[PDB]
């Protein structure tokens, strides 16, 4: 509920490059500053003879908003023999898939082709570039002697990647082995150490991978999309992988053991061609210390009361329990052909409530199909099915839909306020936009009536100006507030107290404040956050029985509060927001007996 | 609140009333009976959309016998039978096809086959009354090839269904799109592998009878495909030779107005498949409503010849000519805030209901 959608940071790349196709955050361990990583798979690079090679750009944030390319590869196509190229980098889609772990940046080119040494062919094997420190190496786990359709020739390695907290690279290669698909996982140290530019096929010693299977599993695309998390309690991140065309195009998600690749779990879709497993993610969404699994199914059709099928998109959410069992519920999208669930991105604890929150996109939804991102808050019972905030795309289609929300990444705090931010790509317009999370204020608002019971003859005080005796009661209210991240010390609040308002407008109010002869009062209050409740007491009296609708009714005592929002801002102009899961309207009742 | 059924001369022979006008208030409802009466001896437009990848050459050679034999059998089911023809292979991009310069034109490596260049969808013959012309177009059809098992079936179907001005579909006909294959088809999101990340816009993109957005747009989803097939009143018949038949069969519940059968291993039943599929389709009547009017809800119950009731678009089965099916249509308004269309799936006639409101 706390994202700032009024003052986002907007970035752009070269027209037609699909800038924003893939996004991540770059956070060096000790550089003091952070950058955004935005891919542009069709970008025209300066490489000698490569067309639309693709690139990854490092984008700044503080001060100005500018992006510059990372030189992972600054050469052309290496020869195998005179006038006989080994590799084909044109249209390789470099930057299509980008991930970074602290200083380590892994960027892949899923459409990279090469000839192999055996025969002069052109196979879409796929390669990745891993950069750390000041050294860059080429990682090409499928560029092996196991070639062609029955081998890794059509692997497209690097199609989808992630990082393991153990410093391992998880790579999906959906085309391996007659498109059965393959997962390959290796160590960062091995990838960096065992590198030689004169060697095309490199073996690693601590490599894990899936193997071939029966033809019944052909065309499953295992490793279409990957994610990591601990699903067996071993302290080792395991491997979550989407296999969208598995089980007779129902789609499946597999979880493999992160240590030895033994299979641990198998999730299945319900509907054919829903493409269950398109995207996967894992995060603790309920505070149970067990990773939960989020599986998209963007083409899912939700049948209505008349039997009509509406293509909306679905996300399956399953919670991990200690027994190894999963508890699964279903979240449906909101709009037809919006493809809800095509992108899932854990945000970490966006609102600092103790539970992780998650963003789910629907890139073709909203007016003009600009694209929408839905923010869903977590809780102890699992994900809240009702979205708290909706982010809409801000650009018109030029030739294709902006596809806002196509790719997202959260759980990184760029503005350094304790509340993680969210980067959302919109590649159809060659843009990327960063939404920052506002600080959240929790407010303790009290209201008390002393006494709640009174009558018209209980004359206890006199009126101002002329000391006429009236019945009276005291109304007290007070307010304290705080937050968890970086908030202004002084919170400027507006409060209003209303008396006896439960009646027809224009009606006589019987309970009035003595000094104003009025049913209402407001005050300007300054609350130190984390300080004492600031209290006030106003004295109310009843009008006598000459001006009334009745004599014996309830008297409502009602308090409302809100923030000022003029002085309530940090150095970037980011304003705090009140917790949207609490009321700012409270009441007590008094009665005339 | 009322319902008015026009007493003006009707312009529909199957679906009546073809025009309804009602007046609603929130909390109110009104209803009427919609009658659907299937005809005998329809004009029929049968378009053959054929998978021409290498694995299909065994079935393609049998289409030479189909022309005249099918025409004769259909004489008892139709009044005017026209045949058309087109073909598809796959999207002409990596990794689906070879992109090697010496094997771009000839995807196959079998030196006994002078195979055709790969293509997405090509229209070969416009629907015609001439059987000989159909057989000729088939006889000269060459076989192509590709690398990945699945084929670009759904993409070709959408274009065949949508590009009415090129195919020559008649309004005054039962429109039949027959799809021949042995393998399953690609899905909309499978195209990501080829670097295609742009959704199918559902439009017609033919130039010289060739689909030219085949390499830039992804495959249509089943949602998009059923929407276009129903909108263009096209009934679909799948003819599948392989074990993959069951894959297509189990998609039928997701694609209203679709039927599927098996091609025998000898491919000797191509005509029986079409005739049986036709007879089955003509015997099933179901309706759906396109409701774009905000605040309005519909509840339709079919009343079958045997007195049974079947809700919504479940419809009635074992329906013949000289046999009327009734649809009990109730329209209710829930909230204040145009027209809706109620139509049998696979029929050319529709009933348009206009909804007037006051609050």
């Amino acid at each position, epitope marked *: 509920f706390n994202l700032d959608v009024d003052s986002p940071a907007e970035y752009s790349g070269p027209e037609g490059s699909y800038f924003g196709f893939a996004v991540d955050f770059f956070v060096p361990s000790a550089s003091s500053r952070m950058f955004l990583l935005v891919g542009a798979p069709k970008a025209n690079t300066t490489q000698p003879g490569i067309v639309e090679g693709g690139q990854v750009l490092k984008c700044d944030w503080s001060s100005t908003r500018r992006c510059q390319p990372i030189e992972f590869d600054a050469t052309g196509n290496r020869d195998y023999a005179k006038d006989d190229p080994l590799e084909f980098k044109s249209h390789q889609w470099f930057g299509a898939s980008v991930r970074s772990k602290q200083d380590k940046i892994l960027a892949c080119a899923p459409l990279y082709h090469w000839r192999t040494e055996m025969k002069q062919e052109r196979e879409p094997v796929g390669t990745c570039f891993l950069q750390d420190g000041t050294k860059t190496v080429e990682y090409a786990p499928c560029r092996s002697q196991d070639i062609d*359709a029955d081998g890794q020739g059509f692997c497209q390695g690097g199609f989808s990647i992630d990082f393991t907290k153990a410093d391992r690279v998880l790579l999906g290669g959906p085309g391996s082995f007659y498109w059965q698909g393959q997962l390959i996982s290796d160590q960062v140290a091995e990838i960096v150490s065992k590198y030689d530019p004169n060697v095309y096929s490199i073996k690693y010693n601590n490599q894990l991978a899936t193997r071939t299977a029966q033809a019944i599993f052909d065309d499953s695309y295992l490793g279409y999309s990957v994610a990591v998390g601990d699903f067996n309690g071993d302290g080792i991140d395991d491997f979550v992988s989407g296999v969208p065309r598995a089980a007779r195009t129902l789609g499946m998600v597999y979880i493999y053991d992160g240590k030895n690749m033994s299979s641990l779990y198998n999730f299945t879709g319900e509907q054919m061609a829903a493409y269950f497993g398109f995207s996967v993610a894992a995060t603790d969404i309920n505070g149970d210390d067990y990773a939960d699994v989020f599986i998209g199914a963007p083409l899912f059709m939700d049948r209505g009361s008349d039997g009509k099928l509406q293509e909306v998109g679905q996300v399956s959410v399953s919670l991990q329990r200690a027994s190894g069992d999963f508890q699964t519920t279903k979240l449906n999208g909101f709009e037809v052909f919006a493809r809800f669930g095509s992108a899932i991105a854990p945000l970490g604890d966006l609102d600092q409530d103790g539970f992780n929150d998650i963003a789910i996109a629907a890139p073709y939804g909203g007016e003009d199909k600009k694209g929408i991102v839905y923010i869903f808050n977590g809780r102890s019972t699992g994900l809240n099915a009702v979205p708290s905030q909706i982010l809409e795309g801000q650009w018109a289609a030029r030739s294709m839909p902006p596809s806002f929300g196509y790719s997202m990444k959260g759980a990184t705090d760029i503005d350094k306020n304790g509340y993680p931010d969210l980067i959302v790509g919109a590649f159809g317009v060659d843009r990327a936009i960063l939404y920052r999370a506002r600080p959240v204020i929790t407010v303790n608002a009290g209201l008390e009536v002393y006494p709640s019971i009174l009558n018209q003859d209980n004359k206890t005080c006199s009126l101002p100006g002329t000391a006429l005796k009236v019945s009276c009661f005291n109304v007290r209210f007070c307010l304290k507030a705080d937050g968890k991240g970086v908030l202004p010390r002084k919170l400027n609040f507006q409060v209003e107290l209303l008396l006896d308002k439960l009646k027809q407008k224009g009606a006589i109010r019987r309970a009035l404040f003595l000094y104003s002869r009025s049913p209402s009062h407001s005050k300007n209050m300054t609350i130190s956050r984390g300080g004492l409740m600031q209290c006030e007491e106003l004295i109310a009296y009843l009008r006598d029985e000459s001006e009334f609708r009745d004599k014996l009714t309830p008297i409502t005592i009602f308090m409302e509060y809100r923030l000022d929002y003029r002085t309530a801002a940090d150095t970037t102009g980011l304003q705090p927001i009140l917790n949207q899961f609490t009321p700012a309207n409270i009441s007590r009742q008094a009665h005339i007996l | 609140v009322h319902v008015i059924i026009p007493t003006e001369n009707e312009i529909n022979t199957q679906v009546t009333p073809g025009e309804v006008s009602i007046q609603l208030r929130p909390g109110a409802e009104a209803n009427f009976m919609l009658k659907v009466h299937p005809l005998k001896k329809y004009p029929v437009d049968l378009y053959y959309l054929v998978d021409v990848s290498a694995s299909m*050459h065994n079935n393609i*050679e049998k289409l030479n016998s189909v022309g005249n034999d099918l025409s004769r059998k259909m004489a008892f089911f139709s009044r005017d039978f026209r045949l058309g023809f087109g073909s598809y292979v796959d999207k002409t991009v990596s990794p689906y096809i070879s992109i090697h310069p010496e094997r771009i034109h000839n995807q196959c*490596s*079998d*030196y006994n086959l002078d195979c055709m260049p790969p293509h997405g969808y090509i229209h070969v013959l416009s629907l015609t009354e001439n059987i000989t012309e159909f057989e000729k177009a088939v006889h000269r059809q060459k076989i192509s090839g590709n690398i990945d098992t699945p084929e670009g079936g759904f993409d070709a179907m959408l274009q065949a269904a949508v590009c009415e001005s090129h195919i020559g579909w008649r309004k005054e006909a039962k429109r039949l799109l027959l799809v021949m294959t042995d393998q399953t088809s690609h899905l909309a999101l499978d195209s990501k592998l080829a670097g295609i990340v742009v959704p199918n816009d559902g439009n017609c993109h033919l130039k010289n009878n060739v689909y030219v957005k085949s390499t830039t747009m992804e495959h249509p989803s089943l949602g998009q495909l059923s929407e276009k097939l129903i909108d263009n009143n096209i009934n679909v018949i799948f003819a599948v030779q392989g074990k993959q038949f069951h894959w297509y069969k189990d998609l039928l519940p997701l694609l209203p107005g679709t039927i599927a059968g098996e091609i025998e291993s000898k491919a000797a039943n191509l005509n029986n498949l079409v005739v049986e599929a036709y007879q089955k389709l003509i015997s099933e009547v179901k309706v759906q409503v396109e409701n774009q009017v905000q605040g309005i809800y519909f509840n339709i119950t079919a009343i079958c010849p045997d007195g049974s009731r079947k809700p919504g678009m479940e419809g009635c089965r074992n329906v013949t000519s000289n046999d009327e099916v009734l649809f009990n249509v109730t329209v209710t308004m829930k909230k204040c805030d145009n027209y809706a269309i109620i139509k049998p799936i696979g029929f050319n006639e529709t009933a348009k209901i206009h909804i007037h409101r006051n609050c």
Partner: antibody
Amino acid sequence: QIQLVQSGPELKKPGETVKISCKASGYTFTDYSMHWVKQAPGKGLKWVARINTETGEPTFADDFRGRFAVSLETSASTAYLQINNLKNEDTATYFCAIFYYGRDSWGQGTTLTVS
Amino acid sequence: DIVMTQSPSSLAVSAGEKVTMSCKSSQSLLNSRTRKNYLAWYQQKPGQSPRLLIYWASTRESGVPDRFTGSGSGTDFTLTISSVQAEDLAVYYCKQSYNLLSFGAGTKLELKA
């Protein structure tokens, strides 16, 4: 029905050149390549060459280069095999053929004798 | 290119017997991209042009009776005739189309006396 009609028997002396025709009917000539196969008088079949009738580009087997040439006259649906510098070893029946699986065909076989 | 070795060169049969003949390639004839074995069998009766019986190892050609069954994969292929007829006395050849087309020596069926 596809038919292939070859020229009649040829008798040549050593060193002479023979041109063997193959006329196609029943299909479009430029649709399928034309293959040539040599059958020595008592031995098995040896593939010699294929020509793509669409482009005119020949492909030869390793053992039949230099002395063999293949050409087209598309206007008359006819393919030709020319054998230069005939040797006694070239005595054989020469067949023209289409190997497309859907509709394969063979000519009657041209008998070539070298004295 | 690819040498096809066919064996035996001659095999005598009696009518009604099951007869097998085989052919061994020099390399694999299996196309990994199609999963098919590019080998075919031909029948040549004396005085006549040859006729295709089987293609892609086991796919039977139209007009060919089912007594002719092909099988095999990779490099090793077999042609078997169930209940051989007097009309089947012909020379059979194996052919590969993995690379340039090539034929084996051929197997002549003879009749037992």
